Amino acid sequence: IQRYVRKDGKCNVHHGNAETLVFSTHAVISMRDGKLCLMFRVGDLRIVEASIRAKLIKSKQTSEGEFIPLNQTDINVGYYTGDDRLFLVSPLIISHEINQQSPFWEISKAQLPKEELEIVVILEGMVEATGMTCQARSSYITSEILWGYRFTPVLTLGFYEVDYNSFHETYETSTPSLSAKELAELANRAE
């Protein structure tokens, strides 16, 4: 029985091939555990208070008729479950469940071609060798979030190996084109 973490804490991972492996180049939207999800991958420069946060940047007009040049809307990535405090040894695909509280609630494969936004990702977590306070950030514009895609796995096992050549790799999978909001609407009247 090959364990991932030793009783004394040492991780049994083998990493195998510039900060190009910190964040995946694209993010995707697809189904996982019955939910449409915004996903992107996180690695390392290769977890002391390692926390992740995501914001949606976009222009929008409020119902009051006010135009907001660049408004920030939160993107729940675990803050409500502690899942945002990452145990970050091997690559992790961060998941944002699209629900009625999400800024992507009414985003559909069709609306994506019209919408213009920017998902900013911020990772903070004191370093391993100095415990120093560092922050890495990334961004995903509208054209960098792939609807109907899924990430290829990077972990396998006589070592627990990470294949970083597939870090940024995704592929298409049958996915409804509807937005979660349209889905709740359909099911309600297609029931």
Place this chain on the structure above:
Amino acid sequence: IQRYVRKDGKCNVHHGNAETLVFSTHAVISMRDGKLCLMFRVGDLRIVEASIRAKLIKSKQTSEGEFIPLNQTDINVGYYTGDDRLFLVSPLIISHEINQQSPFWEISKAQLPKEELEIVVILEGMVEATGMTCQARSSYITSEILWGYRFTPVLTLGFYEVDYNSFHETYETSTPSLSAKELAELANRAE
């Protein structure tokens, strides 16, 4: 497509004209997305664990007949959504939704002239160049929160420019004079 944040994290912002641009001189109360909101602006001395908190300081007599010289009441500014963890590159207008849980629940344009309070704002966030732990504070007395006002935008775009000459600038906009509490009461009997 000019992006706000580069794939490697660098921000594409141009700041353009003493810590006078950290907090806006006044705060305002007006409608945003269907809700009466207490708002004030945040900038920088020009975000590692950049967090904001707001407290309402005021004297009050409890129902037990006890007079509290200076009582502190919390002012929700995102603690319940993670929105209080700021991504603070360009100016941000902090929003406090006035609801049944807010200390301003029954504050009306009329009561404002009678009430006496002090909103203290506290910003904490390790610095960029040393990652050091710093804290900036500000205050807004009753006469410094403008009912029926809205902040002028400061961002525009071939750069993403911040015009700090309008940082403290606000203007009047038609706003109901009622307190959120009176509003729920009216709607209930004006329905």
Place this chain on the structure above:
Amino acid sequence: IQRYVRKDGKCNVHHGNAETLVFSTHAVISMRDGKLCLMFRVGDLRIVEASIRAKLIKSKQTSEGEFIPLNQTDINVGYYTGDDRLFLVSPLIISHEINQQSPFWEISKAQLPKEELEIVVILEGMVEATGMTCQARSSYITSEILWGYRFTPVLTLGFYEVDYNSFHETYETSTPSLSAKELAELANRAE
């Protein structure tokens, strides 16, 4: 209009008479805003991430018949509202609302003479002059929590002065002798 905090953040407080003024010597239980409350006072060695936490230490037998020598039970002091992140310039009386989720739910003035417990208080908050990480702790045994008592105020105003000679001072006030649990039971059948 004398303000508590200046626009630039400086506090306008005058402190006036060994770490004897960090925590009040006793804690009390009495009514505030219609709720029976456990209270104790916090000062300073005279707030960068200044947070407070309270635990109840006591022996107890679980319903499974297991005797727990020293069990720790949480004492909510604002963790669910952000109120536990203290803005700590002048003395503050920490409040623990006794409800169905509190370990003191069924504690009555009568049971107090029988019960044996220990409320441990832990304060953490990077220091002002170095921003260093410090922690101060205190304890209140059963005989150090005064039922039917209230703390004397310490703040007044041409300065905003703190009189630390009354820091530890409390006095008796008419208070129901019932536990919050008995109170909900009475009201239910005395309605």
Place this chain on the structure above:
Amino acid sequence: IQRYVRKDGKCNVHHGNAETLVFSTHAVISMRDGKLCLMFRVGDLRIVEASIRAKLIKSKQTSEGEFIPLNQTDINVGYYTGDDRLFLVSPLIISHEINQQSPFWEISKAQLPKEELEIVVILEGMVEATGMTCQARSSYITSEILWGYRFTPVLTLGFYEVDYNSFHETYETSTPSLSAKELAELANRAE
């Protein structure tokens, strides 16, 4: 009346017999306060922001038919009550209540022999002598979580002594073999 913590904060504990006493060698599952609970013990290398987090590592196939080599699922250990911020002077047995939100919801004494998983525990808390940022980790594979076991106590009292020779010691106690999920199902139809 021997108190656990002095008024000035000093702890009145006597520790009595390599980092072998940081985490208990096994974890157990048994009943405490009417709930089936995953438990393990925490000690010290012998609490400034001392926080604990637990993750469940395992392979799983999503309903979409996707095989996840090593998926991480959160294990609630107090994040929703503040109980995860440990006051860590004497040994503490961390408790994870198995409910509908837990990854062990449907784990039974029978399924345990079939299941393969890994509970990773991560403890973070600035040190006492330097206030430095340290992290200790441990792991419990499926064969290291004992169903129907309970930990022996380690505390007693003319000192408040910790007997670390029983730190890792557990014993069997009558415990239902059903998973919490089967239990809710039984009670529903055995009512």
